[PDB]
């Protein structure tokens, strides 16, 4: 059994998005449906439920009144509007089955199915690439790339086009005071290397279509 | 209904058995179930109904309890077991579900001290007029590590920024970066920039620096 989910997005403040799930390998309409999600730094949130029918739905207090539950039992899909729209529900979203009864002993209470997840990230930011700036060495030396004010997440970053693996270590991203990310990728390598290897970090940022490498020296 | 979790990080040594707790602010029955949950994947079903193994999950989970008090074993902790492990209730009506805060499990090794490096501002980021000022803190554990940023002796606060890695793959350490940023007016009216780093595996605390 799946629950296959898709939709989400990148919106301004107060705008709106849609999630949806498509039921595959059970009867769908024979179980509640929930909405579940995951803040970044924060826990499970339960978020929605509708019931097997549709006939009742209930949510949790944080967003009554703006996200709206909903089902379709001849397509079998599981929706979420999302209205009226808040930093705070920047998350990843999951669509949740109701656990089984099996004649007394199980109860309905857990979540047997989930969606993969899907993130929401609400922001007044627009879109714009990072600038890449390098981490110059100052047995063993380190080297970087600080990947600065870009949005939205994520960028990608490689060292030597993949061929340096070894000691890399990609931080992730903190959401500056600015509503722009930064981040950066560092490695650590034999100081006998920074003479012979050349050392350049890919950087990635596809929202944008960024895409920068830039060489690391001495 | 308010379900506690602990402790908040569980360290164990691979192989080691281990004992996640999770606490219900008034009685819930059996209706306490257990999920794992790794970044970037959704939360994987562990425990039903206090003690029932989901399907497909090995015997070196088991969960136990009734009535307010619950727990999760893990056996002997294999690799793939670091996660964070979340319980949950909900009941008939009203409908909501709710979830403790989650347990962190990670790999337990000895202790290793940081490599401590700093990185002044870049000539071309100084020319695009903000000064990043980072501070590395490379292949360390345990997690727990304290950075302070001084600027000509002054102690910075509200201007710094820190990132932590996931546990190594390899080698179970933790990297971190502190970053430090200020107008590149206020980066040229001072001198001397210095991180200075506290963490276990240091007899005493590490200060790296430079002068502008
Ligand atoms: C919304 C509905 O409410 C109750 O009837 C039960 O909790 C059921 O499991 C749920 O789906």
């Known amino acids: 059994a799946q629950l296959v989910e898709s939709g989400g997005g990148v919106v301004q403040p107060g705008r709106s998005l849609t999630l949806s799930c498509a039921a595959s390998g059970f009867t769908f309409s024979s179980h509640g449906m929930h909405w579940v999600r995951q803040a970044p730094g924060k826990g499970l949130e339960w978020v929605a439920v509708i019931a097997s029918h549709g006939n009742v739905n209930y949510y949790a207090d944080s967003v009554k009144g703006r996200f709206t539950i909903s089902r379709d039992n001849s397509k079998n899909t599981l929706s979420l509007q999302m209205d009226s729209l808040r930093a705070e529900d920047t998350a990843v979203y999951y669509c949740?089955?109701?656990?089984?009864?099996?004649?007394?002993?199980?109860?309905?209470?857990?979540?047997?199915?989930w969606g993969h997840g899907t993130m929401v990230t609400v922001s007044s930011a627009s879109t714009k690439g990072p600038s890449v700036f390098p981490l110059a060495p100052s047995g063993t030396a380190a080297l970087g790339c600080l990947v600065k004010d870009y949005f939205p997440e994520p960028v990608t970053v490689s060292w030597n086009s993949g061929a340096l693996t070894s000691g890399v270590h990609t931080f992730p991203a903190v959401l500056q005071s600015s509503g722009l990310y930064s981040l950066s990728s560092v490695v650590t390598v034999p100081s006998s290397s920074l003479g012979t290897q050349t050392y350049i970090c890919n950087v990635n940022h596809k929202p944008s279509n960024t895409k920068v490498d830039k060489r690391v020296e001495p | 209904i308010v379900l506690t979790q602990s402790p908040a990080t569980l360290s164990l040594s691979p192989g080691e058995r281990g004992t996640l707790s999770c606490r219900a602010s008034?009685?819930?029955?059996?209706?306490l179930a257990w999920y794992q949950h790794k970044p970037g994947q959704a939360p994987r079903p562990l425990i039903y109904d206090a003690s029932r193994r989901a399907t497909g999950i090995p015997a070196r989970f088991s969960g136990s309890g009734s009535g307010t008090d619950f727990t999760l074993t893990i056996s002997g902790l294999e690799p793939e077991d670091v996660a964070v492990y979340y319980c949950?209730?909900?009941?008939?009506?009203?409908?909501?579900?709710?979830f403790g805060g989650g347990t962190k499990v990670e790999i337990k090794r000895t202790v290793a001290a940081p490599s401590v490096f700093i990185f002044p501002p870049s000539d071309e980021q100084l020319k695009s007029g903000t000064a990043s000022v980072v501070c590395l803190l490379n292949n360390f554990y345990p997690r727990e590590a304290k950075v302070q940023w001084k600027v000509d002796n002054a102690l910075q606060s509200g201007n710094s920024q820190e990132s932590v890695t996931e546990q190594d793959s390899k080698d179970s350490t933790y990297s971190l970066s502190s970053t430090l940023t200020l107008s590149k007016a206020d980066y040229e009216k001072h001198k001397v920039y210095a991180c200075e780093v506290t963490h276990q595996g240091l007899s005493s605390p590490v200060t790296k620096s430079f002068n502008r």
């Open positions: 008034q009685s819930v029955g059996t209706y």
């Open positions: 949950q209730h909900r009941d008939s009506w009203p409908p909501g579900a709710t």
């Open positions: 949740a089955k109701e656990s089984d009864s099996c004649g007394g002993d199980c109860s309905r209470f857990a979540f047997d199915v």
